[PDB]
């Protein structure tokens, strides 16, 4: 009779019932459908996986084993669609990209 959660029923590692709880007492609609928390759980799981993949090779490009928000900031702003998504957000301890305009160099 005992069965496991909906997350591994959908094959997901993010909590489906917790997403359903936050949807129901988040006061967005009075009736919440069944397939909506599974869809939202899959979307947020994929976005987290893509973000951690980008932070992963950004941290391998610095020869380290830990993730600093320098790596997160770099992995955000060298990718164009995350640039478009996260344009107006500022990350804690991020800094800026190394850039210099063409005529400002010692051209000679």
């Amino acid at each position: 009779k005992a069965s496991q959660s909906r997350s591994a029923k959908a094959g997901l590692t993010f909590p489906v019932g917790r997403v359903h709880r936050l949807l129901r007492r988040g006061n967005y609609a009075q009736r919440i459908g069944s397939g909506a928390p599974v869809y939202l759980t899959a979307v947020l799981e994929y976005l987290a996986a893509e973000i951690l993949e980008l932070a992963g090779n950004a941290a391998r490009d610095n020869k380290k084993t830990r993730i600093i928000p320098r790596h997160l900031q770099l992995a955000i702003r060298n990718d164009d669609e995350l640039n478009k998504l996260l344009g107006n957000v500022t990350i804690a301890q991020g800094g800026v990209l190394p850039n210099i305009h063409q005529n400002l160099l010692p051209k000679k």
Binding site: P69, N88, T90, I91, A92
Partner: peptide, 8 residues
């Protein structure tokens, strides 16, 4: 105002 910061 749309100047949101993350982390805290």
């Amino acid at each position: 105002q749309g100047r949101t910061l993350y982390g805290f």
